[PDB]
Design a protein around this ligand. Structure first.
Ligand code: SF4
Ligand code: SF4
Ligand code: SF4
Ligand code: SF4
Ligand SMILES: [Mg+2]
Lengths: 173, 184
């Protein structure tokens, strides 16, 4: 039983707001063109082995069911862009899902594993940083012991941190 | 994922077959006129407090999902006839649900409580038979100690017992006459 009291009339507008200016007002606004045909759901590789239905994410955004932000299903999207490519109403589906994930992240719905990966990029500058075995491996192949990356350039590490602090990505985590 | 191999293309026809001649071929074949509008679901008293969705029953019958016969949901219908009354395609919804319940009963999907009630009607002739307290209550308010009903007429009790046997309703509920109770 869904009552008007259980719905947020501004959900779509709030999703568009979050998607402005990146990926864009026009891009996220495309959710309003959806005519619930299901082409996205039938194209979804994740939907073939789970309860995830791409079309229902857009339906819930239009209807105002904010529980979609607390959903585990929105995080089952692999961003394969098959829905995006086949949508007959030009809905930028994959981008709307990512924008919805941003609001889910703001509300605290981030899996610990994802927060760990984000922490590695902040601390070490890389999601998959170099290990002790890495240096040994690279030398044997005939490459530099350490790659020319941010993990070893103190300048770049502090640059990323000031940006992460300015964006509040640290507080998001 | 639903494949063609998971569906029964003859489900609708089998539901209509069961509904022939009672309540009628025309009545049960009305399921084929459904256009999935949901008026029945929005009208359903049971759907407001459960996962039961009246149009999904008709959808599953048309699609060929026979798991609908194993469903607990079809037994949540109170037969209020609100869907029947409001259907814009004249689908005799309540009758289709009852016919689907007949196939569910044939497959063994019947509750002991319902089987107990059916057993009381063939054994004592009544779903709620008279007790010792009935005789006391009735005579205390001017009524006959025993009502003029089948429970006290061996003639009418035997008539029903012959019809029950002819219809095979005794076999359906699993009632044995020698044992005098529901088998298994
Ligand atoms: S495909 Fe485009 S239009 Fe059809 S449902 Fe998915 S999003 Fe809405
Ligand atoms: S992008 Fe996400 S949603 Fe669209 S199809 Fe690939 S997985 Fe399913
Ligand atoms: S109301 Fe009549 S038509 Fe509309 S869904 Fe229920 S049965 Fe099908
Ligand atoms: S008749 Fe059965 S299904 Fe139709 S509304 Fe009343 S309860 Fe719901
Ligand atoms: Mg979903």
């Amino acid at each position: 039983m869904i009552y008007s009291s259980d719905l947020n009339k501004n959900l779509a507008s709030q999703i568009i707001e979050a998607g402005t200016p990146i990926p864009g007002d026009d891009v996220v606004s495309s959710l309003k063109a959806c005519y619930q045909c299901g082409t996205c759901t039938g194209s979804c590789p994740s939907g073939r082995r789970t309860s995830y239905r791409t079309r229902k994410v857009i339906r819930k955004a239009l209807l105002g069911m904010d529980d979609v932000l607390d959903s585990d299903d929105i995080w089952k999207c692999t961003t394969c862009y098959t829905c995006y490519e086949r949508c007959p109403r030009d809905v930028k589906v994959t981008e709307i899902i990512k924008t919805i994930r941003n609001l889910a992240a703001q509300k605290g719905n981030m899996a610990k594993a994802h927060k760990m990966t984000a922490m590695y990029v902040l601390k070490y500058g890389h999601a998959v940083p170099a290990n002790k075995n890495t240096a040994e491996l690279r030398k044997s192949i005939g490459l530099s012991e350490k790659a020319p990356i941010a993990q070893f350039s103190e300048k770049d590490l502090n640059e990323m941190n000031t940006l992460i602090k300015e964006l509040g990505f640290d507080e998001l985590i």
